[PDB]
Write a protein that binds this ligand. Structure first.
Ligand SMILES: O=c1[nH]cc(Br)cc1O
Ligand SMILES: O=c1[nH]cc(Br)cc1O
Ligand SMILES: O=c1[nH]cc(Br)cc1O
Ligand SMILES: [Mn+2]
Ligand SMILES: [Mn+2]
Ligand SMILES: [Mn+2]
Ligand SMILES: [Mn+2]
Length: 200
């Protein structure tokens, strides 16, 4: 088949909000999305997974975690997760500091992806085109904050999480895995996958 451009793929297959946040992040770190294109797709993918991990998860009036998949959550519901990824540096640390000095949870050395108000911990999300165990160890060795929970997804459906604690129900994680499989399949139709996989 014809070889498509990763640029076209990203713009067609991700929400404009996600694409814009990804471009802003790459700029901040001095990478050009029109040149590091496999990286731009990876950043979008990771951001989307962070959002999906958060979606539909609330804390109810009794303080219990619940799932609301309709469009309207009753006004008394609280989002279960704080999303750190996607924010610029200053705002991201502002949010982390607020959580920390409030909940008593200790300050991570690197910006994590999420904070879980049910489990009372930061989460680092990872999305890998390689074996989940290898990537898990890489993340763990990088942060070693060792209060930060790590949850790794691969494009082929494997997961690895700290202490075999997967935080979410199967259905939620299935949504994420389905999305990753969709991304892989579409890239493959455009002959973009092989190179995207090998670039990590
Ligand atoms: O948190 C980030 N680190 C590095 C890159 Br490139 C993009 C991010 O959002
Ligand atoms: O937290 C992350 N930020 C950006 C990238 Br690319 C990967 C991450 O795990
Ligand atoms: O995730 C990010 N979003 C925006 C900026 Br600027 C930097 C990030 O790491
Ligand atoms: Mn809301
Ligand atoms: Mn970021
Ligand atoms: Mn992050
Ligand atoms: Mn991450």
């Amino acid at each position: 088949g014809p070889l498509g451009s990763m640029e076209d793929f990203v713009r067609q297959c991700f929400n404009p909000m996600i694409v814009e946040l990804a471009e802003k992040a790459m700029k901040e770190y001095g990478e050009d999305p029109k040149i590091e294109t496999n990286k731009f797709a990876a950043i979008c993918t990771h951001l989307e997974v962070c959002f999906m991990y958060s979606d539909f998860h609330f804390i109810d009036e009794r303080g219990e975690s619940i799932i609301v998949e309709s469009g309207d959550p009753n006004a008394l519901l609280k989002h279960r997760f704080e999303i750190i990824e996607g924010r610029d540096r200053i705002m991201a640390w502002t949010v982390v500091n607020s959580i920390c000095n409030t909940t008593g949870v200790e300050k991570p050395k690197f910006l994590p992806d999420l904070y879980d108000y049910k489990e009372n911990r930061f989460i680092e999300i990872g999305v890998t085109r390689r074996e989940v165990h290898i990537y898990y160890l890489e993340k763990a060795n990088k942060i070693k904050s060792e209060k930060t929970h790590i949850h790794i997804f691969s494009f082929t459906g494997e997961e690895m999480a700290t202490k075999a604690d997967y935080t979410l129900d199967e259905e939620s994680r299935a949504r994420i895995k389905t999305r990753l499989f969709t991304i892989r399949q579409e890239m493959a139709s455009r002959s973009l996958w092989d190179s995207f996989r090998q670039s990590e």
